[PDB]
Every structure is written in C-alpha cells, then in structure tokens.
Amino acid sequence: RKRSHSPTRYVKRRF
Amino acid sequence: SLEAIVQNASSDNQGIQLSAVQAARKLLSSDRNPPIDDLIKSGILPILVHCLERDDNPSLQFEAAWALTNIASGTSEQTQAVVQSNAVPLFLRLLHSPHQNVCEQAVWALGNIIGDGPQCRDYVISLGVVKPLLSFISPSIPITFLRNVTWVMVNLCRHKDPPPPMETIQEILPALCVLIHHTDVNILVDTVWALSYLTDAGNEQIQMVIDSGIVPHLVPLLSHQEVKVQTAALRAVGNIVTGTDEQTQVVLNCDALSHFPALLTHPKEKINKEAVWFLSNITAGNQQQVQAVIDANLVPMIIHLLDKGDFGTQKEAAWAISNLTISGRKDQVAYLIQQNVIPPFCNLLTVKDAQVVQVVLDGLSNILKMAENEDIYKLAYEIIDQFFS
Incomplete structure (x- = not known):
C-alpha cells in the first residue's frame, strides 16, 4: 500500500 | 554594561x-x-x-x-x-x-x-497575520521583503500536529499560486517547500492543493536547474501521490514520469531514493499506473538501483518491486522477471531489516503464485511448502 515519508525550529538572526 | x-x-x-x-x-x-x-x-x-x-x-x-x-x-x-x-x-x-x-x-x-511552534503559530494566526502578510504581495515589492514574506509563509505551513487552520490554508494557497511563477530561486524554493508541507498534512489538504490548480506548475520543476527546487518539488509530488489513486492520476497527467530518468541517474543518492520512493507509491496504485511506469522505461533503472545502489535506495526499490508484483498483472510480473530482477531481489534477503526481508519474501511468493519474526518464517515455510514441495 501507499507509504509516507519518514519523520524528520527555523529561526533566522539579522546581522 | x-x-x-x-x-x-x-x-x-x-x-x-x-x-x-x-x-x-x-x-x-x-x-x-x-x-x-x-x-x-x-x-x-x-x-x-x-x-x-x-x-x-x-x-x-x-x-x-x-x-x-x-x-x-x-x-x-x-x-x-x-x-x-x-x-x-x-x-x-x-x-x-x-x-x-x-x-x-x-x-x-x-x-x-x-x-517556534504550532501553538505560537495558532496564536499569531488568531490575531490575524495572514491577510496583512499576503497584502504585501505586489510586483513593486523588493525581493528581500518578498523573500522574508515567503519564509514566513513556509513557517506558517510547516508544523503538522496540530495542522494549520483550513481557512489559513485556503488564504495561503492562492498566494503560492501567484508566487510559483517567480524567477527568484529562494522564493521558488520557499513556495515549493510550503506546498510540500501542505501536501504532507492529509488527503483533504492534498485535494485543496489539487483544486488550487498548481500541480501542473509543480511537476515541471522536477527538472528545474536548481537541485534545491528539484528536491522540494520531488517531496511535494511524492506527498501528493501518497493519497488516493485519483490524486495520483492527476499528478501523472502532467507528464511527471518524463522527469524521472534524470532523477534516477542523478549522482545524489538522496535524490535517487526519493525518486524510487515516489515510484514505489506509483507502483502501489492501479495496474494502469503500473503499466505507465513500465512504459516510461524506469523499471530497469529501478532494478539497477536495487542491485548496486545505496542501501536505503535498495530498500525503497524493494518496496517498489513488491508493490508492483502484488498490484500487477501476470504480463507485468513477466516483464519484471524478464528484466532480471530475481538475483538482486533475492540478495537482500540476508539484511537485518525485518521489514525489507518480509517485503522481499512476499514479492517472491506472489511472483511464484502468479507464475525471529513469525511473519518471516511463516512465509518462508509457506513458499517452501507450495514451491519447494
């Protein structure tokens, strides 16, 4: 049957 | 100080x-x-x-x-x-x-x-951020500001449990449709990752994405010049084809399988394994879709990967082959055996992964019929009893 992808905080600083 | x-x-x-x-x-x-x-x-x-x-x-x-x-x-x-x-x-x-x-x-x-998280996301959503955020979408916007806006959209779509509100999904998808036609690689990558996260949520979200009318723009990007765009689009269409056969056929109607020879021959084993995963989900569908896969001449490359590829790609290829054997007609299984699949499909039987070992054994048993773990030994005995004896 159909299978889903395996399980795998995006913050960005300003410099 | x-x-x-x-x-x-x-x-x-x-x-x-x-x-x-x-x-x-x-x-x-x-x-x-x-x-x-x-x-x-x-x-x-x-x-x-x-x-x-x-x-x-x-x-x-x-x-x-x-x-x-x-x-x-x-x-x-x-x-x-x-x-x-x-x-x-x-x-x-x-x-x-x-x-x-x-x-x-x-x-x-x-x-x-x-x-940070879905709870903060939901709070900021409740305060009504999506409308003013997407109001900034204009041709006169600087690309830096638009990049930040697209990154915020990705963050809004990212988290899974709980998933973003349906109304916010509905508001965001049209903006993604407008932005999918942008030249900036960063904007395109962010858009594709956002709709990938949206397609990883559930079948109704996949259906909303299909209703938006963006899948035919997503599929071409499988051959985009940028590997980041290619990987994002690959995972997005993979998510979409994990749903119903109707949605899988919608994906296949955009001539998607034409883009997969390069992905199967790509030097990057991660691209290889994700492409093989997509093709396994396709082989787990209708016999007509199995026939489409066979016509695209991707099966010999899948078998070559099963034979000499990275072990993860080998596992995904074993999945694809087993799904084809259980969901394929006798002529298609005959094609498979004609393309010398038995030696490499058998060599994996020695690996430790019980899942892949059982998948290989099941594929072999169903092929023969068409012609530790209890589940493994039981199949080994059943196959040996019917075919060895």
Missing part, C-alpha cells in the same frame, strides 16, 4: 534610549553565542516592547524590532519569553506602519515567533 544599557533604554532622552537600544542590538546581532538570557534577566524585554509603541520614533521602533527579532532567534524558552512580553500584537499593528523598515522587521520577528 548590560544593566547600564537597560537603564539608559528606560530613558526619555530619545538619543540616550536609541543609543542603548542599538547597543543591545549590536550585542545580540554579532557573536555566535549572544547574551540573550542575560539581557532577558536584566529586563530589556518590557522596555523594548514599550519602544515598539512609539510611532513618533520610527528608527527606535525599527531597532527594538531588530533586538526582539534576534532575541526570538534563541531557545524556545526565549521565544516564549518574547511572546509573554506582549510583542506579537504590537508587531501585528506595526505591520501597517507608514515606514517600510518597521513593517519588514515586524514581518521578520513574527516569522521567528511563528517558527
């Missing part, structure tokens, strides 16, 4: 307070290990949140938004502290400022806040 900075920031001399705020911004916007925790302990948060409300001093507002943005770039606890300071509503209000810098920095800070 952290506490002197704090006290000077709590001043009504605009010069002194702005100097202290930009000094704190410098401290927090340079060294890889910034003094976020100590500046929080010194009580800079309420002062900065207060400064955000000073519409008469736009540069003070901007520098405070900068400092809070970088404070929210630390630990989850520090982002939650920023949230507790009552900074989100003031950012939401400054989105409508007559000066573009405060607006863009507020978008940045709200993106950092939303990216």
